[PDB]
Amino acid sequence: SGNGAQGTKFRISLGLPVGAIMNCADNSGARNLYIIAVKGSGSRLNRLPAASLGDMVMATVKKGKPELRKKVMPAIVVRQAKSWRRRDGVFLYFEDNAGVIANPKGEMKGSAITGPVGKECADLWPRVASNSGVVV
Template sequence: MSLGLPVAATVNCVDNTGAKNLYIISVKGIKSCLNQSPSACVGDMVIATVKKGKPDLCKKVLPAVIVRQRKPWRRNIKSVYNSYTISFTHYFPLETYVRVLYIPKI
C-alpha cells in the first residue's frame, strides 16, 4: 500500500462534523525511523487538528481515519482529493454520514 500522506499534510474533511481542513500531527501505530517521516495511507488512523471549520472544533486535536488519497494505491485507480473522516478514540464515528467520492481513471 502506498503511503501517500506524510505528517504535516493538510487535507479536506468529508463528514458533517463541521470541520473543513485537517492537519496531520501523527500517525497511529507508526514507530519512528531515522530520516523518515511517518506517513499514512487509506484506512490508517491519524491524530489531526482542525485548521478550518466550526469555531468549537478549530484548534482541537482529534483522531481521524483516512478514507481516500490522491496517490494510487491499486493499479489504475486514482482519487482526485485526499480526505478524512473524524472519529472518537474508540473507533466510533463522530458524524452521521461520510461523503465518499470514487473517481476511476479513464
C-alpha cells in the same frame, strides 16, 4: 490503524506524511484535517510518519467550526490521491485527500460521509462503512 480496527490491512502506498492537509468529508463542522501523527507508525531517523487509506491519524482542524479548532483529535483516512496497488493488480487513485474525524474506538463524530470512500477503509472501520455512499 490499530485500536477498534476490525480486521487487518494489506500494505498500501503511504500518501500523506505529517503536515499534509486533507479535505474533511463528514458533516461534523470540520472543513479540513491537518495530520499531526499516524497511529501505529514506526521510526527511522528523519523519516516522516505517513498515512494511507484507512489509517488512524492524530489531527487538528484548521478550517471549521470554532468548537472544533485549536485541539487534537483522532481521524480516519478515506480518500487518498496517491496511487496504490491492490492485490488484484490495479493501480488506482482518488481526486483528493480526505478523512473523517473519529474517536479512539473508530466511531464517527459526524453522521454522513461526503464523497466516495475506499473499500479498504470501509472494510476496516464498520462505523465508516455505515455512513458511506459509494464504496471504492
